[PDB]
Write a protein that binds this ligand. Structure first.
Ligand SMILES: Nc1ncnc2c1ncn2[C@@H]1O[C@H](COP(=O)(O)OP(=O)(O)O)[C@@H](O)[C@H]1O
Ligand SMILES: Nc1ncnc2c1ncn2[C@@H]1O[C@H](COP(=O)(O)OP(=O)(O)O)[C@@H](O)[C@H]1O
Lengths: 261, 223, 223, 131
């Protein structure tokens, strides 16, 4: 099927863009400004807009962190690019923040976060999603908790945004967008291309190494001066490939008691 | 702790818990007559005896040879009622008020037909069994237990309570009455028909209303 | 879970489990008369007593003074019956089913010479003694146990049941016939002679087959 | 028999045949390769563990170990009858990773013995005086 592709991270943020090669949209009866439906695991849908890219290949689609999280997918998975340019204008929207991001803020959130975000963008939104707004000093994330008509609606110049209410408690099925990833490391371009080539295969698809019958890696030793970002490479790799990062520390092992260490 | 904690547990739980906890306290000290709360079935068959319609439905003489079993069901109930208010029953207190009444009348008519006296464990496990089938599909593994698979809770709990003690009558009817109501309230309307011909009257809603989403005040101008 | 698992048990064993659980159910709640199954042996001595030749041999009035014993042996029966049926016995269900018949007839006559009425445990431990000795040489160490060496089970298991309970005679009679049958069916033919002069008639194989190998979808590929 | 696969070595078992037991495969014959695979039974050693054909670059040293250990381990009774003293300690030394615990695993698997490895780090760090 000419629908399932591989995903990769983005550069120019823009929570509502995906990059596709020119021939792909040409053979998929697609045109500019056409809203598309993306569907992935757990039967989740995210609505986005498509645009051209200079160096995008046919089988690879570039998209940023926020769109990936909504679909509940990770790097190198497969997605459905099923297109449908038919969305009826929403009438009234209800957007509320997450609890553990608006600690001691208050004020009117509508006119300093949402107002410059939806202004002249015509962002297509879907019920249940999460988006991140770069505030004046923090990064506050919101959650579309109700829409009319449900669930597909595009934000129009004439709607009713009800940003009033108590924040929603953080659920259990999320990635906690305010956490580390591959885009949160700089000055380590070459090294992070070696820890990533020798670790993704044993962790992403484990079953292959059983059938092939070869030896996986069993230890990596990062060395350097303190404060250069070593525990952040291990925390970034665990959060994106999908793993169970379990840290054991130096000092508190050496000082428990006698022979109980 | 005794003050705020008792008022913070859900009102339904806070009164039901105290309903069957403080009564054994009177029994152990023995101020009122312990023999005054039996619910004699043969007496009900001959005379109405308006003295004890519901009175013997909360008195249990917990003590030397009647403890253990009574004590443990308080633990799960306290550990599990708070969950089943949050098991979609928070928005329907009137519905939760109802099947409690329906279950209480269902166990008591069987409690009067055959000659058991203490209908105390049945009301605990019946709602607990109803909680299982209505909140199935989770994995649970406590510290002193095994790694048993999910959706086994209503049957696995049916063994421990049965083998400790006896009186097969109350365990069987309590689970079965929850089973038939499970099909009636939930499965019967979408199976063949026979919709909710037991709707709670508006008077129950008038006593205690439900929870509804409020939209508030809107604000947005041109562009 | 009750549906598939109950049908998952082999029919002979699934017939075994039902008889060991359904019969207790009737007795405890008081459906049939508890005294209706006693197997009066002196009556057998005088009259034929055709009314209850085998019915009283399944009677077990469980009570809360020895019920813990009733649970461990059934626990032992449940998990080990799986082991013995798949231990060199999958292909010979008829041989196994008939071997139960000798283990039953031997006790019931001994139960007539002496005057014991509770004939449930000795048959259970007899096959367990049989199972251990024909499936010797395996190291077993349960969680609440020690690292005791193999081929010690039939002796140690004879100790645990002896202390808990009593009735020294049934333990003795249970061990001996399984030991003699092991000598008779298995050791006597290869010791001196006297082969199987009790062989399984064809009437059994007509009732149920033993086994048959399967070839599969053949291939014809050469050059 | 052991068949060399694309990346593994799969070993089969002739579990049934006809006419039993000697039946040479012919260009017109029926092969039934379907069914649930057999459990690896005991007694026999697997055909995949180490042997004398699994070492190279040590043809001289494996000749010294073999002549010194083949006799005491194969004919235990003869040394009792003749009453001569046998070897009782061999010390293999060299750089790490050169295959020393593989020379001592091939000798046990071929002459027939009860190779019982004890390790250095695990003995040293058990508990105080219980080591
Ligand atoms: N791209 C980066 N490279 C190196 N360090 C970074 C980078 N981005 C942030 N840091 C900072 O480096 C620190 C590394 O964490 P820390 O454990 O304190 O040092 P180390 O990882 O060397 O032990 C983080 O606190 C983080 O703030
Ligand atoms: N002929 C050989 N010589 C040396 N090493 C070998 C040979 N054949 C295999 N090896 C490799 O040597 C490894 C075993 O060596 P090793 O266990 O490290 O011994 P030591 O721990 O004493 O160095 C095996 O994993 C195998 O891959």
């Amino acid at each position: 099927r000419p629908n399932r592709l591989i995903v990769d991270e983005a550069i120019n943020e823009d929570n509502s863009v995906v990059s596709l090669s020119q021939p792909k949209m040409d053979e998929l009866q697609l045109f500019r400004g056409d809203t598309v439906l993306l569907k992935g695991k757990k039967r989740r849908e995210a609505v986005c807009i498509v645009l051209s890219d200079d160096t995008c290949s046919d089988e690879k689609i570039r998209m940023n962190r926020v769109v990936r999280n909504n679909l509940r997918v990770r790097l190198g998975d497969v997605i459905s690019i099923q297109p449908c340019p038919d969305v009826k204008y929403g009438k009234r929207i209800h957007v509320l923040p997450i609890d553990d991001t608006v600690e001691g803020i208050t004020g009117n959130l509508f006119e300093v976060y949402l107002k410059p975000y939806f202004l002249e963008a015509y962002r297509p939104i879907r019920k249940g999603d999460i988006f991140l707004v770069r505030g004046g000093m923090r990064a506050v994330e919101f959650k579309v908790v109700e829409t009319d008509p449900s669930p597909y609606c595009i934000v129009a110049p004439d709607t009713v945004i009800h940003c009033e209410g108590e924040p929603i408690k953080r659920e259990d099925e999320e990635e906690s967008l305010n956490e580390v990833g591959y885009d949160d490391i700089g000055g380590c371009r070459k090294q992070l291309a070696q820890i990533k080539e020798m670790v993704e295969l044993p962790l992403r698809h484990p079953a292959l190494f059983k059938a092939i019958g070869v030896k996986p890696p069993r230890g990596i030793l990062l060395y350097g001066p303190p404060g250069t970002g070593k525990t952040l490479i291990a925390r970034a790799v665990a959060n994106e490939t999908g793993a169970f990062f379990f840290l054991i520390n130096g000092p508190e092992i050496m000082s428990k008691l006698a022979g109980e260490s | 702790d005794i003050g705020d904690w008792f008022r913070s547990i859900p009102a339904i739980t806070r009164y039901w818990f105290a309903a069957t906890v403080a009564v054994p306290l009177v029994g152990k000290l023995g101020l009122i007559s312990p023999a005054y709360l039996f619910l004699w079935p043969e007496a009900f068959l001959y005379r109405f005896q308006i003295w004890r319609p519901i009175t013997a439905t909360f008195y249990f003489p917990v003590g030397p040879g009647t403890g253990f079993l009574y004590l443990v069901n308080l633990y799960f109930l306290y550990q599990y009622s708070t969950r089943l208010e949050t098991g979609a029953f928070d928005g329907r207190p009137a519905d939760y008020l109802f099947m409690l009444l329906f279950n209480w009348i269902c166990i008591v008519i069987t409690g009067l037909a055959m000659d058991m006296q203490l209908l105390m464990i049945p009301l605990i496990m019946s709602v607990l069994y109803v909680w299982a089938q209505l909140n199935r599909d989770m994995i649970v593994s406590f510290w002193f237990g095994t790694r048993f698979k999910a959706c086994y809770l209503p049957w696995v709990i049916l063994g421990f309570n049965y083998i400790i003690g006896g009186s097969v009558i109350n365990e069987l009817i309590g689970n079965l009455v929850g089973h038939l109501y499970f099909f009636l309230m939930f499965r019967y309307p979408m199976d063949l028909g026979g919709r909710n011909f037991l709707s709670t009257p508006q008077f129950l809603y008038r006593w205690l209303p439900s929870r509804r989403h409020n939209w508030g005040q809107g604000f947005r101008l041109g562009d």
